[PDB]
Design a protein around this ligand. Sequence first.
Ligand SMILES: [K+]
Ligand SMILES: [K+]
Ligand SMILES: [K+]
Ligand SMILES: [Mg+2]
Ligand SMILES: [Mg+2]
Ligand SMILES: [Mg+2]
Ligand SMILES: [Mg+2]
Ligand SMILES: [Mg+2]
Length: 191
Amino acid sequence: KTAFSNVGRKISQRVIHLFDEKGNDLGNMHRANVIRLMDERDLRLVQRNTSTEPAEYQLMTGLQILQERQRLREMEKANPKTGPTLRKELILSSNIGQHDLDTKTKQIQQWIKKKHLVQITIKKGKNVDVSENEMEEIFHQILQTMPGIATFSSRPQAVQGGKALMCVLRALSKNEEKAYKETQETQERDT
RNA sequence: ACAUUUAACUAAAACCCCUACGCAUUUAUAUAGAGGAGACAAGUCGUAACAUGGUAAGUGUACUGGAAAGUGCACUUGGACG
Ligand SMILES: [K+]
Ligand SMILES: [K+]
Ligand SMILES: [K+]
Ligand SMILES: [Mg+2]
Ligand SMILES: [Mg+2]
Ligand SMILES: [Mg+2]
Ligand SMILES: [Mg+2]
Ligand SMILES: [Mg+2]
C-alpha cells in the first residue's frame, strides 16, 4: 500500500519537483533546499505523484494531510474497486474418486462465486494410463455443475508433453449471464 | 347356587349343577427401510499421530469443518525449558 503521509526529511531523490502549500509550483530544486523550506515554514512534505519523471512532492501542514487522507478514504468507500483477481489452482488426477471430485467441485464453485480464476490441471495417475480425451471429460463434468455460473476462461490444453491437461475457469460476465437467462427462457417458452 | 327325602315285623333305598379364553396377556420369529463393527484388501483425497512429527501431545466439554481434525476454556506431563 501507498499512504498519504509525510515523507520525512530524507528524500529519496536528489532533484525534487516541489509545490507550495497553496499549490503554487515552485519548480525543481535540490532536496537540501527543500529541507530548509520545511524548517523555515514549519511544513511537512508529501508525495503527490510519482509517475512523473521529475518526482513531484508538495509541502503540506498536518491539518491538510489529514483532510486529504480523509477525502481519499471517503472516495474509496464510495467506489471500492476490487483490484486483485486471485488465481486459485487445483491439481487433479485422472483416477480421482467421485467423493474427492465432488469435494473439489464444491470448492471450485465457491471460488467462482467469489469471482476468482480457477486453474485446473489434470495429471496422469499412478499405475494408470488414460486417453487424453478421457482426462478432458473431467473438465466438462466440473463445469456441468455450474451451467450458468462459470465458463472456460482458457479451454483445455495439453501441457508437459501431453502428460497432463490444463485449464482455467471463470465466472460468467453479466452480459453472458443475461444471455444464458434469455436462452433458458426461450427454451421455456418453446416447452 | 343347591337343601334329608322315602323308609324302619331283619334293614335299606334315593343323591350326578353351572360359569373362563379375549379386540386380553407373555415372549419370540418373519418382513419395507436405515445404520454400526470387524475381516480382507491397500484404490481415492489429504498428512492427524509417532522426532520439539515440523502449530508439543493428550483429557473433559463446546462449536466448526470433505476427511483425518481445527479452535476456545480449564486441566495433565504420559513434552521441552536460561
Ligand atoms: K496436531
Ligand atoms: K508429542
Ligand atoms: K479437547
Ligand atoms: Mg498462487
Ligand atoms: Mg503431522
Ligand atoms: Mg503436531
Ligand atoms: Mg488441544
Ligand atoms: Mg475454526
